[PDB]
């Protein structure tokens, strides 16, 4: 009298192998060499801050997922990515509580108040960075980036470029490798490591070439049309990190192919407009945040054509 007790469900009965955790682990693997370069250049305090941010993020999420009576999905490695990308946006002379406050703002308000993973419309790390810059401008402006051991530099390359003093800026090879006197955010000084990390993600299939190519092409064309150097404007500031890792966020980007091209062109235009005639030395963060607002408007005009539809010339709605 042996039974079977089979399982009944709906089609299909097979699935693929990739999941969310694999994608986030691959993102962390791509981000590792920039962390190695940062630890080599800025010392042992550049790593500890990162750890602090990561811990805070995870803790916050768990507490919320315990209080709202929801499953604790902390093993998808998303808060780790948010914490690492937030920690890469900090100077070397920041106190310990700034990272905690930024992580709490990024996780509790931007992400978990809208539903959770994938339910928001804006970038958490960039919004937390913009909140920190506005709340405490003393700890985040032009002096926190220079290490205390150096007393000759006193200025970052973009500030010298805006002031017109292009005689004391570091050389282009030094700006490209980030190894001789180049200072700034701890995870933006090297463009070779970020390029390698972006190429690895393109090869795996997580991201596409469209946004990273068109962002840099628009920047180069804008720099060439006003009589500037295209190479310098691309290897200085937070452009490679933004182009490869922060403008390709899943929950804030369009899903089609034409919308991505328009999104990249708009980002590249606004970045240079704020850089050249604005009140900031850099405008990458606000250019990306302003294109997260117009994304639902682009997505309603760039839809594809269904199979078998020859379209009616605006007569159904009449």
């Amino acid at each position: 009298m042996n039974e079977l007790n089979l399982t009944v469900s709906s089609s299909p009965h097979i699935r693929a192998k990739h999941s969310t955790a694999s994608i986030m682990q691959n993102v962390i693997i791509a981000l590792l060499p920039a962390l190695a370069v940062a630890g080599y250049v800025f010392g042992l305090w550049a790593l500890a801050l990162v750890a602090i941010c990561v811990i805070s993020s995870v803790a916050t999420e768990a507490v919320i997922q315990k209080l709202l009576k929801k499953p604790i999905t902390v093993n998808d490695w998303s808060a780790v990515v948010t914490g690492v990308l937030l920690a890469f946006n900090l100077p070397i002379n920041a106190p310990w509580w700034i990272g905690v406050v930024g992580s709490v703002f990024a996780i509790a308000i931007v992400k978990q108040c809208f539903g959770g993973l994938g339910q928001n419309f804006i970038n958490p790390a960039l919004a937390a960075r913009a909140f920190l810059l506005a709340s405490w401008p003393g700890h985040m402006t032009s002096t926190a980036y220079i290490p205390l051991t150096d007393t000759v530099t006193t200025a970052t390359p973009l500030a010298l470029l805006k002031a017109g003093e292009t005689g004391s800026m570091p050389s282009t090879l030094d700006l490209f490798t980030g190894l001789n006197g180049v200072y700034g955010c701890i995870g933006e000084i090297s463009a070779l490591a970020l390029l390698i990390g972006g190429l690895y993600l393109i090869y795996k299939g997580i991201i596409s070439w469209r946004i990273p190519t068109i962002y840099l092409l628009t920047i180069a064309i804008f720099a060439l049309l006003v009589g500037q150097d295209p190479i310098v404007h691309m290897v200085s500031g937070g452009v490679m990190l933004g182009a490869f890792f922060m403008a390709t966020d899943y929950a804030s980007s369009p899903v089609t192919a034409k919308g991505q091209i328009i999104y990249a062109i708009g980002c590249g235009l606004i970045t240079m407009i704020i850089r050249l005639y604005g009140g900031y030395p850099e405008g990458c963060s606000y250019s990306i945040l302003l294109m997260n607002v117009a994304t639902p408007l682009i997505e309603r005009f760039t839809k594809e054509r269904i199979y078998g539809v020859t379209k009616i010339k605006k007569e159904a709605k009449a």
């Binding site: 299909p12 009965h13 993973l117 269904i306 199979y307």
Partner: protein
């Protein structure tokens, strides 16, 4: 010969585990001792039994009479004695009225069966009458009647017949064996269908992983200039009657208008072989091919088995269970239906039996959407499955209808590529059912 190539846009690449049963020879099932024949082996109107308990039947004798126009008769597979005219379990999950026949041992042919004729004198009306009388339905899976398909309405014009040889679901190899063994019957059935409809053009579409079948079909065609063979790139939704039309002819079927409005007639190679066999011999449809495979089968193989044999006899003939199964599926892995018991008989549209073990039948719980966008990229109809699923999950049928949810073909792949392991196709099916139901209670 002039072999052209074709392909379409979108799709997936499953592992395609067909190599297990491709090199195994073709097997033949033994003589059955008991058959259960249901009254609904097609779609439309169920038949009415015309036999009683204790009666004696022959081989090929009719045991069911059609009711309306969209209906086909039902015959008997073996010669014996009728023991029950009650209702028995069916593959749809509910009991269906059936006839149980106990075999005698001798195959006595009904003394009213003779060959119909030859190709040179049958003509279209008698060809259609022979097709109706033999109870031939669609062997591609839908089990639509063939005599209805060959009756073109006067307000429609067609000019070509396309045979579907692009067998695309994994684990299935019956069509490969049929094409490699009986190519002449396939060509004869294509010619008969072409004469019946009244056209002078015919195409055959075979995928590029069956080059031996392509060579056999080319050799069987000979010097005929009205027949062509196409090679299609190996993809999953390639053979679904619409991507085949797009790849071979280049036309597109309109939004809800059937292939007959595109001027084509699509038919399967197994149906053509059955038409040719029934014309040559005069016997009705009582036997077909099957592929018994899976992870819990000792000796997977492709075997020819009569209609009415239970699943358990087929499983026992192929070795048995090496381990305890966790899932039994009638069909393929992408469009099959899970079963409850093993007393189910085989039918005219059954193409395989797939048994999976407990470890291979486990899928993780669904999670939150991460807006990756792969489901948009894999859709062959160019829809957006995520929006339809999210609208259907909170009972918004107007938004589902406005997002073109009624032209989905329920093909799998959108649910196959999801990293979050969701159930998009089930939600789309729920939305389609609700939209269809609301058109009857409000009109």
């Amino acid at each position: 010969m002039n072999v052209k190539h074709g392909t379409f846009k979108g799709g997936i690449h499953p592992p395609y585990r067909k190599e297990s049963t491709a090199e195994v020879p073709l097997g033949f099932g033994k003589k059955p001792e008991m058959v259960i024949i249901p009254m609904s082996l097609h779609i439309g109107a169920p038949c009415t039994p015309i036999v009683k308990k204790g009666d004696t039947v022959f081989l090929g004798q009719r045991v069911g009479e059609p009711n309306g126009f969209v209906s086909v008769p039902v015959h008997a597979s073996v010669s014996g004695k009728v023991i029950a005219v009650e209702e028995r379990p069916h593959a749809s999950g509910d009991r269906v009225m059936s006839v149980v026949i106990e075999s005698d041992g001798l195959d006595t042919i009904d003394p009213s069966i003779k060959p119909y004729g030859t190709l040179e004198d049958m003509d279209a009306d008698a060809i259609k009458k022979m097709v109706l009388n033999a109870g031939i339905v669609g062997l591609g899976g839908a089990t639509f009647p063939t005599h209805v398909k060959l009756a073109i309405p006067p307000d429609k014009k067609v000019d070509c017949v396309v045979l579907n040889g692009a067998e695309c679901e994994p684990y299935l190899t019956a069509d490969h064996h049929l094409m490699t063994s009986q190519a002449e019957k396939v060509v004869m059935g294509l010619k008969l269908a072409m004469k019946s409809v009244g056209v002078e053009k015919g195409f055959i579409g075979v995928e590029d992983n069956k080059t031996d079948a392509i060579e056999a079909l080319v050799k069987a065609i000979g010097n005929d200039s009205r027949l062509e063979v196409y090679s299609l790139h190996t993809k999953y939704p390639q053979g679904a009657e619409k991507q085949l039309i797009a790849a071979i002819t280049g036309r597109e079927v309109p939004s809800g208008a059937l292939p007959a409005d595109a001027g084509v007639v699509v038919m399967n190679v197994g149906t053509a072989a059955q038409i040719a066999e029934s014309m040559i011999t005069g016997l009705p449809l009582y036997k077909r091919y099957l592929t018994c495979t899976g992870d819990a089968i000792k000796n997977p193989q492709t075997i020819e088995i009569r209609i009415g044999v239970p699943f358990q006899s087929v499983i026992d003939q192929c070795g048995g269970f090496s381990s305890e199964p966790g899932k039994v599926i009638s069909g393929g892995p992408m469009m099959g239906v899970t079963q409850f018991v093993t007393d189910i008989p085989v039918m005219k549209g059954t193409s395989g039996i797939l048994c999976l073990t407990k470890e291979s039948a486990k899928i993780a719980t669904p999670s939150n959407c991460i807006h990756c966008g792969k489901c948009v990229g894999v859709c062959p109809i160019h829809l957006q499955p995520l929006n339809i699923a999210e609208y259907s999950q909170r009972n918004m049928w107007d938004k589902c209808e406005s997002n073109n949810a009624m032209d989905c073909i329920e093909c799998g792949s959108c649910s196959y590529i999801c990293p979050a392991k969701r159930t998009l196709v089930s939600s789309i099916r729920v939305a389609k059912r609700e939209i269809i139901a609301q058109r009857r209670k409000g009109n």
